[PDB]
Amino acid sequence: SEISRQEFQRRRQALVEQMQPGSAALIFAAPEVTRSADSEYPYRQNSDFWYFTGFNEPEAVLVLIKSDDTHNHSVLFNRVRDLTAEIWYGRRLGQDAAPEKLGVDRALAFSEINQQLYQLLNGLDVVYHAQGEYAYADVIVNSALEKLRKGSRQNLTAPATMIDWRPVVHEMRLFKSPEEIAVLRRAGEITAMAHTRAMEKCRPGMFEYHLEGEIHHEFNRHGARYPSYNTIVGSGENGCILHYTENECEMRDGDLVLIDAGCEYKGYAGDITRTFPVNGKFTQAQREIYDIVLESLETSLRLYRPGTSILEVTGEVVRIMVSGLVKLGILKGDVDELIAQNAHRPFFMHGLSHWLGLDVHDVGVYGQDRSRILEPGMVLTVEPGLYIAPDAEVPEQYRGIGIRIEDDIVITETGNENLTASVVKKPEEIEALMVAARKQ
Template structure:
């Protein structure tokens, strides 16, 4: 028996500082969890380092100090896992300044990244049974645990320590199962292809995607197939393409981020179904030039599909899969290349009657079914969207801190994008809007080329895309850090509108109902300032606010910034738990508006993202200030530092 660990674990705060210096968007607990997961999954050779680079740092190697600290961490974890005295411990923040809530958050991060590392080493994790399988299921549940900050801290601390001990033992059980009893060599390089691709879409469990496919299959008629195509690549200019972004519906069911792909879900009857993926073949030359491909051999284990076929053979294979079915579910008109493939297959079946071929009788659009599914977010989706909100809030905070008169709008955009990338969100979820002065009155202003003037406001509407899901925040603040009186008067009307909507949104309400209350606040405020004149109710009946508030109050949010899902007439759909939506009141007063001169050219929008809960809503983007006094204080402090 070994009585001590030969390699010392680096200090938590030291690792935290090194991660921040390198711009790695993980906490020390999350990094420890990831490395522990790789080791407990049986990955014991040097391949752990490039895997960690792929998963956390866009494939780039770390600087010398961080790399050495992580090697020491890896060695210490390895020693403790191999020690018969159960010396393995979770790596969580400690000390008087660390609250129980801090430790709870760190634990959730550790577990999430442990499962990620374990899944990379053991891609068939969902097929693990017995005690280890139950422990893995428990870890998935623990990763989603929340807490109420009003809870008794002493009780919470006791419960937390029990959970930490359970997680520790579960990790050791995984190590015994995968690394001791059944050591497995790391998969060949081609089976790890999706690690680099997954960064732009997300780390969701394979079970999440499988569950979605099963939900769709349950709503399909027997003797049918659903055909869901990947997005084609988009040419930017000449031989240059835009960065690839997967079709949101295809991603929703696969988590696969390559073009030239088709998911086929076949429902033979109420008890038998299977899935087939068409994807690109491995091609050494193409992969040298354009990046790795998953291929057919690795796809079933990586993506949880039953079979994978070459996309280059789709015209010879697809019609055989559809032969004899009664119906196909297909989004006709979405992509021209997909229409051509599908209708060529159907034509082969129609012309092949003499060869006993039979074409489906009907083509049904799957989008109403799928888009209703996407409207209600799962626990895994909400965890990702919370992080998207957090990163987006950090970016808006940075913009407030960095803003100075004389900068250009595109320079503030650069600060936003910097913060997105720093925290692992490589792309924005839509084109960033940075509108200084009267440019803030242009709703979708994206030129971002003007100079920011002393005395003007700047409106920033920006959100990151994190693991495929969109954040969407708007903040408006003074370029010089201090609101003028007219700016503050308009701002406070918009802020009151937002805060009222946040209080009203809950199950049983609708966007339409909440919007009516917001309109009343706006019109009342505009009358008070002399911008509108007349009796309040009459002005409301005549939609007198429309010249100044011309867009909707809210839209769905998810894999797309204007996410899919039915609103019903006049956005009267009753809200239910799991729906995620924006709240974005605004007032825009053109420079030539017939209003008191001091208000002309002021454009203000304030926007947050919320999820409807059982008893109200949760604000996913509360991490950036929005009260005028708080904005001024933040900007003043930044100028003093």
């Protein structure tokens, strides 16, 4: 699945629609990033730029100009085609194929941007710019405006009003279209298949990074070349570290292993977290902590729908965590009192949900304490967890236990759709899965 050319145009129009007459929106592409010396990291396009263009190239600037309520055109600045640069690095689009390929009106050379941009801005009243996003962008836009302020003798005028378009654009990215939901849906299946794979390959003696390998390979097998974020494979005490990415330790029999890994498919992120026994059989202590986290997840999945909020559902989860923690001796006291004093924080110290989209931790306003009312189109993760420090003053059997069980969902008109439910989470199911795999 993917975003059709019709859709990028629709997005560009949706933004233009909100623009004031006599203005221009400048959206810059992401700079190339060094990994070491004359080596660069696999290029990743700025998410906002990509959202409107789907163009995976550096040194590109999309300009949307709006004259009035029905008159608007677009200018794209991108790299000039060049034969030496194309024999070495990859094929470029160039100004000639650009207008047709990217659905833009005019396509100029990036090398000409400083000679061209001020001409495009001259005479307008407003210019939408994400000031501070990129330093190279700030230099360009500022000198275009300084040329305009300084050239009144040449009859040039600079738009006195600058407006950040991020709030507007991010508010748009917050609500997914059916096309996007279809992409994310695939991102979910791919990530789910990867998680199922790790569970089936896991054996005591294997290193944590080995499961990172199996996960990344499965991503690749379905056309998702890169992970949306750095893979977490924390076994034993490592599972207590939220973003444990070193994955350097040998997975031992008896310990649990928490895998937090997601694929990047057509620019969209997949978040899945699954915790399971390295040996395929949960101990009673492990099962006791797991059940509380699983109930938090299952209940939240049941609760999430239009009308509620992340804050509201989180309350139901805190309640479940405290109740369960008291029953095991991890917490001591009256449930309602412990709740009121937020007694779960030393064990569950992060949010229950984040927006999900082009960025794992997607854009979009949450509202104070993430209280915003959920509406159809919003896509989020559902990820309860309990991390009992190795030196926590609680019954020994719970020390060094880290468990998270994260699903990705879409708020539908009546409830929500679970994009990552194709990878098992119930303990009997996880055990059955691992046992079936260990035959062969």
